[PDB]
């Protein structure tokens, strides 16, 4: 009886239904939520997708439904708990993706039974172990199989693919941990295969399997992020794939030149990713016949020459072009403007000389160019004013060049501008007062390590979308505009190493998402505003997440960097940055910006050092639970160290040196288990150094020049 | 009687014998040689300077003649008198003036034992027709190069040669036709073939060419072959090929990677002068025997110098000028330890001069560093002083600065110091050519050099060409210049030189080009400048690339050394813009006389020279430019100027010259640019030549000139 089976599913499996999705399941079964029936009154499809259901799934309880042909359980928190009751199965579509299944015997069962299965999606689970079983030889209908993003591991069986039914069209094995020699894997007849991906595994080999050439109908072949080695197959090999639209051999270990015979795909090829290998030479001239190519990604290779002009410019339909991290010298080719559909151009980290490309914007058509990225090159001159004509621009990155001169107002007035990134040049001038009023409401304004002068506009408050402001190591003066507190998406504010005066505006406490505040090495006076901690426990993560960054940790003392946006820049260029190459010891962390809290966070990085701030430390500062760096050194702070600082559980760096702090070191600091860099020297501190935690573990230099501190590592208090 | 034939040859054929090559004229006769029998077997009259009319029959009548050597003379073609058989095995009629190709048809029909024949460097005209007779089974060498053959070649021409042929040279003619039409036949024993420097067209090789399995040299240069270089398996047919030249054709596309199939044996490759793009394929790392690689005048780019060429262990000569190679000169190029000649001129190179070749674990063999018309910066590195084998350094048209290290001036074998169009500073050391090499060219014009020209220049007795114009030189011209008897060109314009024009310049036996304009010189015009007139001998300054910019304005433009520089780079130099109207002639230096010449170019304008014009100046018969303008010259214009037969430019303006214009100026047929304005000249304008058609500005500012184009003298 169907009513009974479904009741048995809700009680054994469902452990929590916080949305009451299954409140309708009471007593015909056909009116129940997610349940659909034939006219006979028999269940033929259960759909409980994205239902907030937590439970332990044993498919055998649901498969007992003799007429169940569709089962949708994707987007819940179903764990695994199979019993292998061989209840029999007539499923034709099954989607269990995005759960917490771990026992891969469910796949064995579904492939053994379920001889009418047409599409199965097991992706985005935690299915572990080896792949062993393929759909039963009696299954003659299966077309799509998605096993991607699980924990499959070890070697793929030599005949795993070939054993699949002839009707197979889609097979996705990406995002696992399977290994093996790719040349040993058989695709069998490969009659219907159109989509195949082994991306993001650990698959090796210097040869493709002969069998792969049998897949005459292949349309997307994705073998990226493995360890394939040798040279890319050439000769007549790519003639076997007359329908291929998307190919990726990216992020393997390929070397040599790009075979000219790869152009045999150019009748159909729409997407090509050969990035992240060790390819040398150029894109061969034969690729001029790639009339349908829309996305060409060749970044992170050793390519060189003039192929951007002699080849790429002759590709009419190209929209996305990435050649960063290569060895391409000369000046940016002008013919690149013959590409009238180019939206994204990434030429960062090459050896380009000359001036910035201006031609794209002054073509017979309104320019479609949205992203221009030419960081870490040798471009010189000034930011061309013609860029104003690229009304579609959303992102400009000219960082780490030798650009000079003012920033034309035609940049600040680009309507769609969002990211203005140009740090590590020699740009002069100031920030116009019409920012984000006549130009785009920016998300990022990153102009650190330039020669900018004047005051930060009070119209910076109009940039409500702002996520990241960096103006460090410029020559800005004036006061921090109190209007910064109107920026509620703002997460990172770096103004260190300028000559800013006035107070630290208390309005910075209204910056709801501020997690990184750096005002070091300015001329700020007044008191530490208590409002800087007012968002503690309320901060939400935001869109600053997911950006390339580097962090240079200086290791030369309190007298001897920091966070930088690092899209398209080689780490070598940072080591050789005159500022970085100075301090003897340097460790470069790098990655993508990521939050450590999903909600209810606090500030993460607070550096107010080398100013003239006076007064006492607001007790509220000690409640920033996610704060990792707190540098208040080299100021004129007075009073005591708040006992509330014992609540800085995440703190790693705590610098209070070179102030006029008095009293005792709070014993609750002994409970800071991650504190690895403390400095309280050059104060008026006295009394016992707390015994617990890491406080006894620091070099003597970090307690020096106080008014009678005692206890290890200093001489004992009982002897004085 | 053989003696009777040789005598009938001397008197009937020979018309001049200034060396008395035939004095004793039989086996005792010069060139005549016989067997023990006494039968003529070989007549050798090479390099004899004989003038005559040759009819090979008068010599083939010699029944036993097996060798004939008449190369290096001046024989013309003669009527086909008589008809005898031919027993020749070696025939050499090269470097003569033969015009009738019947001599080839006869040799190909009658000389059936002929092994090697050379008709090269003659004037043989008409179409190629006959191939060596099929009865000839021994002809191994046939050289018909450097003649005047024309029209299409017979399809069967090459294939109709017998099968023992090993060397055929058809180069240096004017033959046309699609290359695919030519049949090579079985091509069993052919090892060297050249069709170079003709007008062959087509986009396919003839299929029969693949039959030449034993080919060691294939030279197809300087034609109109079009398309892409054959790839695939084609070059596998030539497992012995040592030298290949497809240069100066119309090939386009990339260099086939499959051309690397020759790398087991290939020693010489010349693909220059086409429209090739990309780079040398990586597959070429297998070319362990490649000695000479020439890819100049293409459109190549990339780091293949580093990824490929640096891995070629046996290179000695590397030419990549006139390409699109950007970035710094790769340091890995020093891995090429046998590199003798390096030419990277006219690319897009940045960074510093490549000097690493001299710090190898062995003394470098580098003889020629040529990297002109690039964007190099910094200073001439001192590390170049360690390349003790350097003979030629060409760093012109870069952005170099600073002083020229003393280690350069002491390079013992140095001969050509060519670094013009930089911002180099300092001076010429007083120790030039004493501890360093005795130079042939010192070309440093358009720099910022200071000081004086050291008297030590007199030690550079090999000097052919000195250029220091547009510098900041001061002091006097050293009288020691007169010791340079091979000096042909001396350019010192646009400096601040003071003093006299040294009369010792008249001892420069070979001086033909002297430019001292726009200096601060005083004194008199030394008459000795014309003392070599009628005696000048041509010399080794011949055969050098040059450009001449004609301005239509001071010495702006003028003559420059132009090895490895693009004309565009001259058009955009302010050495063009100074005068608004400009035009660029270019070529190779060449004398218009073989002996008994005079000076060719003499510009002394914009100085303060006083006195009268030496009458002797009018006897310079090959002088094409005489500019004495803007000085303080007095006296009259010598009537001897009617002897300046070759003059094109005569500028005598802005002086204080008095008197009449010589009527003999009207006899100067090539005088197209005259200026006599701003003097005290008077009287009629000579009625001859082009003098009545010059603009009024060329006679203005004078004291009573009359006659067309001025108002008539009688009114
Ligand atoms: C193939 O075949 C062919 C034929 O066809 C060939 O070719 C050849 O080659 C050769 C080589 O060797 C050469 O010869 C040489 O040369 C040089 C120069 O060169 C340059 O030039 C030239 C000329 O040009 C002209 O012409 C033409 C035509 O004809 C044209 O095109 C051009 O444009 C020009 O024209 C111009 O001019 C003229 C005159 O004036 C006029 O007319 C007109 O109008 C105009 O203006 C040329 O040709 C050349 O070319 C080359 O190079 C190029 C670049 O590189 C290329 O592209 C090409 O292709 C060619 O190549 C070749 O070479 C190269 C190298 O360079 C190589 O790599 C390759 O492979 C090839 O080979 C040029 O551009 C001259 O210099 C020389 O002379 C020398 O030698 C002689 C003998 O023979 C003598 O007599 C003289 O004197 C000299 O000597 C020297 O050296 C020696 C040793 O070696 C010694 O002993 C002496 O002493 C001397 O020394 C020096 O140094 C020293 C120190 O050590 C001192 O002390 C002294 O003083 C001196 O300085 C020769 O002649 C020819 O030319 C050719 N031809 C043709 C046609 O091309 C080939 O080879 C074949 N191939 C194969 C592979 O086999
Ligand atoms: C072959 O098959 C493979 C899979 O096997 C497939 O590859 C996938 O391609 C995806 C793109 O098509 C890609 O997903 C996007 O990735 C973007 C960033 O990509 C870079 O970084 C990732 C991550 O790099 C990590 O991890 C990799 C591997 O794990 C590692 O190799 C790296 O070194 C690096 O590791 C480091 O960081 C890790 C993470 O912290 C850390 O764990 C490590 O320790 C280490 O430190 C790489 O994969 C890439 O190579 C790149 O380098 C990302 O930006 C993007 O997000 C956007 O899209 C998502 C959904 O599409 C949205 O959720 C998200 O919000 C973003 O949305 C933006 O764009 C959409 C439009 O698409 C727009 O609607 C949004 O509004 C937003 O717009 C933005 O711009 C507009 C202005 O235009 C603004 O207004 C907005 O505010 C926004 O700024 C994607 O998530 C995926 O990573 C990649 N997977 C792998 C494994 O490579 C490949 O495509 C197949 N190939 C073919 C040819 O078919
Ligand atoms: C901003 O602050 C800078 C930095 O000076 C800091 O140290 C000096 C001690 O020399 C101290 O007087 C000042 O309050 C800061 O803490 C000032 O520049 C400094 O000016 C002093 C004047 O006595 C000079 O001695 C210093 O050499 C000089 N620079 C440095 C690096 O020490 C600057 O004048 C201050 N004001 C403004 C508007 O920028
Ligand atoms: C903007 C935000 C999202 C950033 C980019 C976030 O992703 C990063 O993870 C930020 C939070 C961290 C990157 C590493 C950097 C340093 C690296 C280092 O030297 C450590 C020394 C010692 O051990 C104490 C802890 C230190 C200071 C940590 C503190 C956290 C960091 C700033
Ligand atoms: C060093 C020597 C061997 C040189 C390089 C030799 O080769 C060249 O041929 C020299 C002699 C001649 C090249 C052309 C040049 C110019 C070209 C020109 O514009 C002419 C204008 C007028 O119509 C008549 C005279 C002019 C000035 C002639 C005079 C002869 C030249 C200098
Ligand atoms: C199997 O289901 C998964 C999960 O629903 C699909 O992956 C999702 O694809 C959509 C396409 O719009 C993305 O928006 C989601 O982010 C993906 N889920 C992730 C990344 O967890 C997958 O496409 C399905 N299989 C097939 C073959 O389509
Ligand atoms: C600002 O300009 C200076 C001067 O151009 C840059 O520093 C010089 O960079 C060149 C080229 O790399 C080096 O040759 C010099 O040695 C550098 N130092 C000097 C001239 O003192 C500097 O990098 C530029 N700054 C930024 C951030 O790009
Ligand atoms: C965690 O944060 C949430 C919001 O992100 C807090 O819940 C509410 O927050 C709003 C302000 O956004 C307050 O007005 C409400 O009173 C809060 N609701 C409550 C407490 O039920 C929540 O307080 C935070 N929890 C902490 C800091 O422990
Ligand atoms: C080749 O020898 C023949 C035969 O002696 C020469 O022909 C005679 O030349 C003389 C002198 O010009 C004439 O008078 C005769 O009429 C020619 N014919 C005879 C003798 O039959 C011929 O001149 C010789 N060739 C050369 C180049 O000297
Ligand atoms: C080479 O021989 C030819 C004749 O074969 C000579 O040419 C003639 O030379 C005279 C001067 O002696 C001129 O008057 C004639 O006009 C020339 N004739 C032709 C047809 O050019 C030439 O002089 C000889 N050259 C030498 C011996 O160097
Ligand atoms: C001497 O140096 C100057 C300055 O570098 C050169 O002239 C400059 O060249 C640069 C690079 O092409 C141009 O951007 C400048 O506009 C030029 N003119 C200046 C700075 O006034 C000059 O060419 C050098 N000398 C020679 C002979 O080439
Ligand atoms: C052509 O030049 C030659 C060689 O210079 C001159 O003839 C000889 O000149 C030398 C001196 O170099 C004298 O010793 C000889 O006596 C001269 N021989 C003669 C004149 O036969 C010759 O005078 C010059 N011819 C001219 C200028 O017409
Ligand atoms: C002589 O040399 C000068 C100096 O180079 C050339 O022209 C000058 O070029 C410099 C470039 O630094 C300028 O400062 C001067 O204004 C230029 N013009 C003049 C008239 O001095 C000059 O062209 C050279 N002479 C000729 C005839 O070309
Ligand atoms: C698709 O699958 C069917 C059934 O297995 C097979 O016969 C056919 O050849 C395959 N290909 C196409 C293009 O239909
Ligand atoms: C020419 O080639 C043929 C065939 O290889 C051979 O018999 C003959 O000896 C060759 N002749 C010479 C002179 O090498
Ligand atoms: C130059 O020679 C050294 C020594 O053999 C070698 O290791 C290096 O890779 C060579 N460089 C190149 C670019 O081949």
Cβ atoms of B458 and B434 within 8 Å: the answer is no
DSSP reduced 3-state for A45: strand
The tokens describing B435, both together, are 């501890």
Cβ atoms of B235 and B258 within 8 Å: the answer is yes
Dist CA A386 CA A400 (whole Å): 21
Select from B16, B21, B51, B99 the residue to mutate for testing ligand 10; criterion: most ligand atoms less than 8 Å from CB.
B51
Q: Are residues B9 and B149 in the same domain?
A: no
DSSP symbol at B166:
-
Closest CA to A612 of A474, A481, A520: A520
Cβ atoms of B168 and B174 within 8 Å: the answer is no
Quick one: which ligand is closest to B557's CA? 13
* Cα–Cα distances in angstroms (integers) from residue A368 to residues A28, A394, A398, B132, in the given order: 58, 11, 19, 70
DSSP symbol at A501:
B
Which residues in chain B are closer than 8 Å to A282, comparing Cβ atoms?
278-279, 301-302
Q: Tell how far the Cα of B397 is from the centroid of ligand 6, in angstroms.
A: 61
Query: Residue holding tokens 């116009």?
Result: A432
- Domain presence at residue A263: no
- Domain presence at residue B59: no
The tokens describing B20, both together, are 């008395």
Cβ atoms of A453 and A477 within 8 Å: the answer is yes
Quick one: which ligand is closest to B123's CA? 10
Q: Are residues B127 and B12 in the same domain?
A: no
Closest CA to A294 of A276, A277, A269, A313: A269
Q: A285, B327: Cβ pair inside 8 Å?
A: no
Distance from the A310 Cα atom to the nearest Cα atom in chain B, whole angstroms: 8
Atom nearest to A425 CA in ligand 7: 28
Dist CA A48 CA A67 (whole Å): 17
Q: Tell how far the Cα of B108 is from the centroid of ligand 1, in angstroms.
A: 32
Q: Are residues B648 and B594 in the same domain?
A: no
DSSP H or E stretch at residue B2 = helix B2-13
The tokens describing A82, both together, are 């199979």
Does ligand 8 come within 6 angstroms of the Cβ of A537? yes
Q: Are residues B502 and B437 in the same domain?
A: yes
Question: From the DSSP assignment, how many helices (H) and strands (E) are in chain B?
Answer: 8, 54
Q: Atom 6, ligand 4: which residue's CA is nearest?
A: A593
Interface of B with A (CB under 8 A): 253-254, 257, 277-279, 281-282, 299, 301-304, 307, 324, 326-327, 348, 350
The tokens describing A708, both together, are 């009678």
How many angstroms from the chain centroid is the CA of residue B66? Answer: 38
DSSP lists the bridge partners of residue B558 as B549
Q: Atom 11, ligand 16: which residue's CA is nearest?
A: B332
Length of chain B: 715
Q: Tell how far the Cα of A652 is from the centroid of ligand 3, in angstroms.
A: 30
What are the φ and ψ backbone dihedral angles of B309, each rounded to 5 degrees?
-60, -35
Q: Are residues B604 and B659 in the same domain?
A: no
Q: Are residues A529 and A671 in the same domain?
A: yes
Q: How many CB atoms lie within 10 A of CB B650?
A: 25
Q: Where are the alpha helices (DSSP H) in B2-101?
A: 2-13, 57-60
> Burial, B79: exposed, middle or buried (Cβ in 10 Å; 0-12, 13-18, 19+)?
exposed
Dist CA B663 CA A191 (whole Å): 100
Closest CA to A199 of A222, A178, A169: A222
Q: Are residues A565 and A591 in the same domain?
A: yes
Query: Residue holding tokens 């009982």?
Result: A718
Cβ atoms of A374 and A352 within 8 Å: the answer is yes
Query: Residue holding tokens 């005002």?
Result: A519
Number of structural domains found in chain B: 4
Dist CA B200 CA B374 (whole Å): 35
**Nearest neighbour of B350 by CB, restricted to A256, A284, A353:** A353
Dist CA B164 CA B116 (whole Å): 11
Q: Are residues B513 and B621 in the same domain?
A: yes
Cβ atoms of B107 and B86 within 8 Å: the answer is yes
Q: Are residues A88 and A138 in the same domain?
A: no
Query: Residue holding tokens 């204080």?
Result: B656
Closest CA to B532 of B622, B401, B435, B648: B622
Q: Tell how far the Cα of A454 is from the centroid of ligand 3, in angstroms.
A: 18
> Burial, B611: exposed, middle or buried (Cβ in 10 Å; 0-12, 13-18, 19+)?
middle
> How many CA atoms does the CB half-sphere of A358 hold within 13 Å?
12
The tokens describing A593, both together, are 């910006």
Does ligand 13 come within 6 angstroms of the Cβ of B496? no
The tokens describing A43, both together, are 């269940």
Q: How many CB atoms lie within 10 A of CB A665?
A: 26
Cβ atoms of A656 and A637 within 8 Å: the answer is yes
Residues contacting residue B446 through CB under 8 Å, at least 6 positions apart: B420, B421, B422, B469, B470, B471, B575
* Listed resolution, Å: 2.3
**Nearest neighbour of A305 by CB, restricted to B253, B278, B282:** B278
Rg, C-alpha atoms of chain B: 30
Dist CA B21 CA B403 (whole Å): 58
Q: A281, B282: Cβ pair inside 8 Å?
A: yes
Q: A330, B348: Cβ pair inside 8 Å?
A: yes
Does ligand 3 come within 6 angstroms of the Cβ of A545? no
> Burial, B85: exposed, middle or buried (Cβ in 10 Å; 0-12, 13-18, 19+)?
exposed
> Is the bond into A114 cis (omega within 30 degrees of 0)?
no
Cβ atoms of A296 and A321 within 8 Å: the answer is yes
Dist CA A486 CA A506 (whole Å): 12
Cβ atoms of B415 and B390 within 8 Å: the answer is no
Distance from the A454 Cα atom to the nearest Cα atom in chain B, whole angstroms: 36
Residue range of the domain that includes A7: 1-119
Cβ atoms of B241 and B215 within 8 Å: the answer is yes
Cβ atoms of B366 and B390 within 8 Å: the answer is yes
Q: Are residues B641 and B615 in the same domain?
A: no
Q: Atom 11, ligand 11: which residue's CA is nearest?
A: B399
Mutate which of A306, A327, A350, A380 to disrupt the B interface (most B C-beta within 10 Å)? A306
Dist CA B352 CA A93 (whole Å): 67
Q: Tell how far the Cα of B144 is from the centroid of ligand 15, in angstroms.
A: 23
- Domain presence at residue B555: no
> Burial, B452: exposed, middle or buried (Cβ in 10 Å; 0-12, 13-18, 19+)?
middle
- Nearest residue of B to residue A257, measured between CA atoms: B282
Closest CA to B49 of B21, B91, B86, B10: B21
Q: Are residues B621 and B656 in the same domain?
A: no
Dist CA B198 CA B223 (whole Å): 5
DSSP reduced 3-state for B603: strand
Dist CA B409 CA B405 (whole Å): 7
What is the full DSSP assignment across A306-368? Answer: SHHHHTGGG-TT--EEE--SS--EEEPPGGGGG-TT--EEE--SSEEESS---GGGGSSS---
The tokens describing A640, both together, are 């005591």
Cβ atoms of B3 and B24 within 8 Å: the answer is no
Q: What is the 3-state secondary structure (H, E, C) of B276-314?
A: EEECCCHHHHHCCCCCEEECCCCEECCCHHHHCHHHCCC
Which residues in chain B are closer than 8 Å to A305, comparing Cβ atoms?
278-279, 301-303
Cβ atoms of A247 and A223 within 8 Å: the answer is no
Q: Are residues B685 and B705 in the same domain?
A: yes
Angle at the Cα of A376 from the Cα atoms of A371 and A381, rounded to 5 degrees: 85
Greatest pairwise CA separation for chain B in angstroms: 93
Dist CA A98 CA A78 (whole Å): 9
Q: B303, A353: Cβ pair inside 8 Å?
A: no
Cβ atoms of A482 and A457 within 8 Å: the answer is no
Dist CA A431 CA A418 (whole Å): 15
**Nearest neighbour of B324 by CB, restricted to A302, A306, A353:** A306
- Nearest residue of A to residue B302, measured between CA atoms: A305
The tokens describing B524, both together, are 């008199």
- Nearest residue of B to residue A236, measured between CA atoms: B232
Rg, C-alpha atoms of chain A: 31
**Nearest neighbour of B307 by CB, restricted to A280, A330, A351:** A280
Dist CA B157 CA B178 (whole Å): 14
Dist CA B280 CA B330 (whole Å): 15
* Cα–Cα distances in angstroms (integers) from residue A614 to residues A508, A603, A617, A660, A703, in the given order: 18, 22, 9, 9, 21
User: End of a domain among A97, A119, A141?
Assistant: A119
DSSP reduced 3-state for B541: coil
Distance from the B230 Cα atom to the nearest Cα atom in chain A, whole angstroms: 15
- Nearest residue of A to residue B279, measured between CA atoms: A281
Q: How many CB atoms lie within 10 A of CB A424?
A: 26
What are the φ and ψ backbone dihedral angles of B563, each rounded to 5 degrees?
-70, 125
**Nearest neighbour of B279 by CB, restricted to A281, A302, A353:** A281
User: End of a domain among A202, A227, A252?
Assistant: A227
Distance from the B123 Cα atom to the nearest Cα atom in chain A, whole angstroms: 45
User: End of a domain among A227, A258, A276?
Assistant: A227
Does ligand 11 come within 6 angstroms of the Cβ of B421? yes
Query: Residue holding tokens 């096993």?
Result: A147
Q: B253, A306: Cβ pair inside 8 Å?
A: no
Q: A281, B299: Cβ pair inside 8 Å?
A: no
Q: How many CB atoms lie within 10 A of CB B297?
A: 20
What are the φ and ψ backbone dihedral angles of A516, each rounded to 5 degrees?
-140, 110
- Domain presence at residue B638: yes
> Burial, B715: exposed, middle or buried (Cβ in 10 Å; 0-12, 13-18, 19+)?
exposed
Q: Tell how far the Cα of B472 is from the centroid of ligand 2, in angstroms.
A: 62
- Domain presence at residue B23: yes
DSSP lists the bridge partners of residue B145 as none
Q: Where are the beta strands (DSSP E) in A555-686?
A: 562-565, 586-592, 605-607, 614-615, 629-631, 636-639, 653-655, 660-663, 677-679, 684-685
Dist CA A439 CA A418 (whole Å): 9
- Domain presence at residue B42: no
* Cα–Cα distances in angstroms (integers) from residue A175 to residues A27, A101, A298, B649, in the given order: 44, 16, 22, 82
Which method was it determined by?
Answer: X-ray
DSSP H or E stretch at residue A582 = helix A578-582
Residues with CB under 6 A from ligand 1: B 171-172, 194, 196-197, 217, 219, 221-222, 243, 245, 247-248, 268, 270, 272-273, 292, 294, 296, 319, 391, 440, 540, 543, 587-588, 590
- Nearest residue of B to residue A353, measured between CA atoms: B327
What is the full DSSP assignment across A98-135? Answer: SS----THHHHHHHHS-TT--EEE--SS--EE-----S
Dist CA B54 CA B32 (whole Å): 17
**Nearest neighbour of B254 by CB, restricted to A280, A285, A327:** A285
- Domain presence at residue B663: yes
- Nearest residue of A to residue B252, measured between CA atoms: A285
DSSP reduced 3-state for A580: helix
Cβ atoms of A146 and A175 within 8 Å: the answer is no
* Cα–Cα distances in angstroms (integers) from residue B554 to residues A496, B450, B463, B491, in the given order: 59, 22, 27, 14
The tokens describing B284, both together, are 């070429």
Find the CATH number of the domain harbouring A52: 3.80.10.10
Dist CA B135 CA A634 (whole Å): 107
Distance from the A330 Cα atom to the nearest Cα atom in chain B, whole angstroms: 5
> Is the bond into B156 cis (omega within 30 degrees of 0)?
no
Q: Atom 25, ligand 7: which residue's CA is nearest?
A: A425
The tokens describing A709, both together, are 């501190």
DSSP reduced 3-state for A57: strand
The tokens describing B211, both together, are 């039959």
- Domain presence at residue A186: yes
Dist CA A486 CA A491 (whole Å): 12
Query: Residue holding tokens 């390079």?
Result: B411
DSSP H or E stretch at residue A196 = strand A195-197
Cβ atoms of B195 and B217 within 8 Å: the answer is no
* Cα–Cα distances in angstroms (integers) from residue A641 to residues A608, A646, A654, A682, in the given order: 16, 10, 12, 14
DSSP lists the bridge partners of residue A570 as none
Cβ atoms of B103 and B53 within 8 Å: the answer is no
The end-to-end CA distance of chain A, in Å, is 88
DSSP reduced 3-state for B588: strand
> How many CA atoms does the CB half-sphere of A705 hold within 13 Å?
12
Greatest pairwise CA separation for chain A in angstroms: 95
Which residues in chain B are closer than 8 Å to A281, comparing Cβ atoms?
278-279, 281-282, 302, 304, 307
Dist CA A508 CA A511 (whole Å): 5
């Amino acid at each position: 009886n169907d009513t009974a089976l479904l009741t048995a599913f809700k009680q054994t499996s469902i452990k929590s239904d916080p949305t009451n999705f299954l409140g309708n399941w009471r007593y015909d079964p056909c009116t129940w939520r997610g349940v659909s029936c034939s006219s006979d009154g028999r269940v033929i499809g259960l759909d409980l997708r994205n239902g907030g259901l937590t439970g332990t799934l044993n498919l055998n309880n649901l498969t007992a439904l003799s007429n169940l042909r569709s089962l949708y359980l994707q987007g819940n928190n179903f764990s695994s708990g199979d019993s292998s009751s061989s209840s029999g199965c007539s499923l034709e579509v099954l989607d269990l993706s995005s759960n917490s299944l771990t026992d891969s015997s469910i796949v064995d069962y579904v492939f053994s039974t379920c001889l009418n299965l047409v599409s199965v999606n097991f992706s985005h689970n935690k299915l572990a172990g080896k792949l062993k079983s393929s759909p039963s030889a009696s299954n003659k209908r299966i077309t799509t199989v998605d096993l991607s993003n699980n924990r499959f591991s070890d070697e793929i069986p030599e005949t795993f693919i070939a054993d699949f039914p002839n009707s197979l069209k889609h097979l996705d094995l990406s995002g696992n941990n399977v290994t093996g020699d790719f040349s040993r894997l058989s695709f069998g007849l490969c009659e219907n295969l159109t989509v195949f991906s082994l991306s993001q595994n650990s698959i090796s080999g210097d040869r493709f399997p002969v069998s792969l050439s049998n897949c005459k109908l292949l349309e997307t072949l994705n073998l990226s992020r493995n360890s394939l080695i040798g040279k890319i197959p050439g000769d007549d090999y790519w003639g076997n794939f007359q329908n291929l639209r998307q190919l990726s051999l990216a992020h393997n270990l390929y070397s040599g030149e790009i075979p000219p015979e790869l152009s045999l795909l150019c009748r159909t090829l729409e997407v090509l990713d050969l990035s992240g290998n060790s390819l040398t030479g150029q894109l061969p001239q034969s690729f001029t016949s790639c009339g349908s190519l829309q996305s060409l990604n060749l970044g992170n290779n050793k390519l060189s020459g003039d192929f951007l002009s002699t080849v790429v410019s002759k590709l009419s339909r190209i929209t996305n072009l990435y050649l960063p991290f290569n060895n391409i010298s000369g000046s940016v080719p002008i013919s690149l403007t013959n590409c009238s559909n180019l939206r994204v151009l990434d030429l960062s980290s090459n050896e380009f000389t000359g001036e910035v490309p201006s031609g794209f914007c002054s073509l017979q058509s309104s320019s479609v160019l949205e992203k221009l990225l030419i960081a870490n090159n040798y471009l010189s001159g000034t930011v061309p004013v013609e860029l104003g004509k690229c009304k579609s621009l959303k992102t400009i990155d000219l960082s780490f060049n030798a650009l000079t001169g003012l920033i034309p107002k035609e940049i600040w007035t680009l309507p769609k501008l969002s990211d203005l990134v140009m740090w590590a040049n020699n740009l002069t001038g100031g920030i116009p007062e019409s920012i984000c009023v006549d130009g785009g409401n920016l998300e990022t304004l990153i102009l650190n390590n330039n020669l900018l002068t004047g005051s930060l506009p009070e119209s910076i408050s109009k940039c409500t979308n702002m996520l990241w402001i960096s103006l460090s190591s410029n020559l800005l003066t004036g006061e921090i505009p109190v209007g910064i507190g109107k920026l509620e998406k703002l997460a990172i504010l770096q103004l260190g190493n300028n000559s800013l005066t006035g107070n630290i505006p208390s309005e910075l406490g209204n910056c709801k998402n501020l997690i990184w505040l750096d005002l070091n090495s300015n001329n700020l006076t007044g008191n530490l505003p208590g409002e800087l901690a007012s968002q503690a426990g309320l901060v939400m993560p935001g869109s600053v997440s997911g950006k390339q960054f580097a962090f240079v940790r200086n290791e030369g003392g309190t007298d001897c960097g920091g966070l930088v946006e690092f899209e398209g820049i080689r780490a070598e260029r940072l080591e050789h940055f005159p500022m970085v190459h100075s301090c003897p010891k340097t460790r470069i962390y790098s990655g993508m910006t990521m939050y450590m809290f999903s909600s209810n966070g606090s500030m993460i990085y607070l550096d107010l050092s080398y100013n003239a701030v006076s007064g006492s430390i607001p007790l509220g500062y000690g409640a920033m639970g996610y704060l990792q760096v707190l540098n208040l050194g080299h100021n004129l702070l007075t009073g005591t160290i708040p006992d509330s600082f014992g609540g800085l559980k995440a703190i790693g760096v705590l610098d209070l040196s070179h102030n006029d702090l008095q009293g005792f070191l709070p014993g609750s600091l002994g409970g800071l288990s991650f504190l690895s860099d403390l400095d309280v020297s050059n104060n008026n501190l006295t009394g016992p150094i707390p015994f617990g935690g890491q406080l006894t573990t620091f070099p003597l230099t970090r307690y020096a020049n106080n008014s009678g501190l005692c206890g290890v590592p200093l001489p004992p208090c009982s002897s004085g």
